[PDB]
Amino acid sequence: RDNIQGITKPAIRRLARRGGVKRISGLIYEETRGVLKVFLENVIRDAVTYTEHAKRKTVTAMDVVYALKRQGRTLYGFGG
Amino acid sequence: RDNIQGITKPAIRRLARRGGVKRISGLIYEETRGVLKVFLENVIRDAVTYTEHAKRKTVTAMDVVYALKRQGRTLYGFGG
Amino acid sequence: KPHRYRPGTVALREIRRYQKSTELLIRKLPFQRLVREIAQDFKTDLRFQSSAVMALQEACEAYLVGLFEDTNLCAIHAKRVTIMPKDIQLARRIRGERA
Amino acid sequence: PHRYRPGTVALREIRRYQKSTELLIRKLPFQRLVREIAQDFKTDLRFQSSAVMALQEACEAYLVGLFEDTNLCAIHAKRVTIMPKDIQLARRIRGERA
Amino acid sequence: KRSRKESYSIYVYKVLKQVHPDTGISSKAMGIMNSFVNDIFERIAGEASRLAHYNKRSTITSREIQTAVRLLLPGELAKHAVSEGTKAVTKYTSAK
Amino acid sequence: KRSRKESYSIYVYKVLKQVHPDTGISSKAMGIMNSFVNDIFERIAGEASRLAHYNKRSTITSREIQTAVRLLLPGELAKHAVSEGTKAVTKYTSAK
Amino acid sequence: AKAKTRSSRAGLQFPVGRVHRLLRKGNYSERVGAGAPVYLAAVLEYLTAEILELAGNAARDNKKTRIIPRHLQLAIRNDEELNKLLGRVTIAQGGVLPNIQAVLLPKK
Amino acid sequence: AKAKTRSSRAGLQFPVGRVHRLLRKGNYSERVGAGAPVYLAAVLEYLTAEILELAGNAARDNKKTRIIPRHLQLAIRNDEELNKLLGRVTIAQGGVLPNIQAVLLPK
Numbered sequence A, B: 001r002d003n004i005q006g007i008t009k010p011a012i013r014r015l016a017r018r019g020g021v022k023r024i025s026g027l028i029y030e031e032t033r034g035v036l037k038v039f040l041e042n043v044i045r046d047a048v049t050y051t052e053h054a055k056r057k058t059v060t061a062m063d064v065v066y067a068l069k070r071q072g073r074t075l076y077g078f079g080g
Numbered sequence C: 001k002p003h004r005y006r007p008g009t010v011a012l013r014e015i016r017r018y019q020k021s022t023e024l025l026i027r028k029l030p031f032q033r034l035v036r037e038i039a040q041d042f043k044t045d046l047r048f049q050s051s052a053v054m055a056l057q058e059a060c061e062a063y064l065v066g067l068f069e070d071t072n073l074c075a076i077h078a079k080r081v082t083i084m085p086k087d088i089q090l091a092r093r094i095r096g097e098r099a
Numbered sequence D: 001p002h003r004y005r006p007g008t009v010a011l012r013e014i015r016r017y018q019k020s021t022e023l024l025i026r027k028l029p030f031q032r033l034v035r036e037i038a039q040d041f042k043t044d045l046r047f048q049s050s051a052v053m054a055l056q057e058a059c060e061a062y063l064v065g066l067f068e069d070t071n072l073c074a075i076h077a078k079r080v081t082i083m084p085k086d087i088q089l090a091r092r093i094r095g096e097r098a
Numbered sequence E, F: 001k002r003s004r005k006e007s008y009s010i011y012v013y014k015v016l017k018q019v020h021p022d023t024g025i026s027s028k029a030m031g032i033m034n035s036f037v038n039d040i041f042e043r044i045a046g047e048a049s050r051l052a053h054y055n056k057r058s059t060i061t062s063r064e065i066q067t068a069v070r071l072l073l074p075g076e077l078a079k080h081a082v083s084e085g086t087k088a089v090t091k092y093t094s095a096k
Numbered sequence G: 001a002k003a004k005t006r007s008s009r010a011g012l013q014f015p016v017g018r019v020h021r022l023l024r025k026g027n028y029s030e031r032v033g034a035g036a037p038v039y040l041a042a043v044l045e046y047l048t049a050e051i052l053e054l055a056g057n058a059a060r061d062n063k064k065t066r067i068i069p070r071h072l073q074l075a076i077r078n079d080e081e082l083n084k085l086l087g088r089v090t091i092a093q094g095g096v097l098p099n100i101q102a103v104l105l106p107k108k
Numbered sequence H: 001a002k003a004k005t006r007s008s009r010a011g012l013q014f015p016v017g018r019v020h021r022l023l024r025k026g027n028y029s030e031r032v033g034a035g036a037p038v039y040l041a042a043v044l045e046y047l048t049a050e051i052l053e054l055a056g057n058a059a060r061d062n063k064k065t066r067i068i069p070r071h072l073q074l075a076i077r078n079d080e081e082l083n084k085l086l087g088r089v090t091i092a093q094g095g096v097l098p099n100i101q102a103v104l105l106p107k
């Protein structure tokens, strides 16, 4: 469907909050959904390449880790 | 024991000019010299370390390169 | 009158709340549905280790939050308190994420 | 008595230097500064002429790019002059300080 | 009798005279091209290397080199690069 | 039963009990410690290797690991890591 | 006949053996010196403690026995050097340092 | 024995030999496929051509036949992808693309 809109206005708020933002423009929610999209896009691609090269049909925690590490964005706690 | 001050107001201006800056606070030149210091310091540290590990009393262009690369500040045309 | 807090007070309580906690701030399923969507653009009928979805949710939120942080500083830099697209935009331009 | 208004020679100097590629720092001052800074880390060190210029390239590149990032931070705050606080913002966002 | 430093400068010059037969190149610019080669050499050899490691493989094949290129290179450059890649390998296994 | 995934978690426990004998560690965090080790393994091994190659050595010595650590770790952290590293080497050599 | 584990010969809890293997099978080099793994397991142990120290504290401060990721996050982010080292590292269930920018706080 | 270079079986300039040797000597793996150094020397060639194409064009406009650094710079920063590729890459004697933010222009 169109699941990007499942990233609720309240959700993006909660995230701005943990980031230490007091006040939020209306325009932000769609810019945010905007950027999140490009993040998950660039990351999932490189993940699935790692899935594909491994000749699997199931994306493993490592695929995403290998991906995040690649993209500049290393993650601790899912292995590797 | 203060060559930093050799990096002349009119020179820092020439760099800012190529960088598309039109107007320059006085408080700037020092802050600049400041940043340059950290940047040179940072790189040469890692440079000389390359020099020391190769038991040489001469720092080589490649030392400077392996360093710039380490710092993610990768440089072309000196033996990359 | 019925009792009421003043614009920006609840926000600040909400900052303290969410900077104290670690729990993920996006709804699990909606995010999952989003992931599997953006996966169909690269291969169909894929599957995902439960753990691979979370590893992304932790990767996404962590990311956004740090953007908001760099954003909120570009708002404050323009004598504001309100984050606006042009603030994010400046972050990403300087971060070197766009041109 | 040909005089131009605060910012018109700037706009020219920008166009002159954006077009060329020569190094803008005088080279001796620069060379010395390096050795000054090398002392800190080891005494009686010698430098390949090319190693120096490689550092001058990197540095002049670094700064010019900062200035492009600084300059936007300035404009972001509805200004046209760059001020320490502009740089400070840039580097903080770039990930050069906390 | 000095060192014996290998460059790529003579493969740049060939390719250069395949794509702009009338035009030349300054040493400075050959320097740059040389670095360029080494830089993308390492990036692909590297990303291939991991590919291998992550799947428990002792061998880097063309297949690794491909996936590497796919990961490292942008949309269009990657498509074309995969093809000159896949083109060149076939032309090789045929030739002899 | 099942295949055998290695870790570092037992060596983290031992070091935790040496450092805070009255303290546990959640799975999720023990993961994060594992990741950490692994990350800083690959980083020191990597730069070690680069150092060897750059200088035409086929052998990664303690001397490389040391210089790796001096390049990767910041001032104070480096000093100590250099110290805890040298100490360990001396005490191993002298044992035979 | 009696085989003392190298880790013991270095007084390291980190497995100098498994480090030596991982290196040779890592494709880092053709040849690994025999001090190298020692030196590395050493440095690894050390930074493992350095974090487990400051975290181990963060846990007490919260009146918690077992260390959770967030203690690690508190530990790493507050110590200046560890934070520089894990500049580009994201820590699962780690949250952020409590920090509210001054100008946002109310006017007393 | 017949003389023929591998490069000249793949129909490449970029030396399939040197590459394969550089791969084994570089400590990337234990084992290297015969197809890799081809596929890699292929890809290295192709990118060398894309850059040298665009740059050659930049050297005309400047009225020049020899490429200088500046042409490469002009070539690369002007192409969206090449720029994406050489983001964190300084090009000595490159200079910057001409660019002046609107607000800094006079009415």
Ligand SMILES: [Cl-]
Pocket (backbone or CB within 6 Å): F060, F061, F062, F063, G032, G033, G034, G035, G036
């Ligand atoms: Cl050794």
Ligand SMILES: [Cl-]
Pocket (backbone or CB within 6 Å): E060, E061, E062, E063, H032, H033, H034, H035, H036
């Ligand atoms: Cl092959």
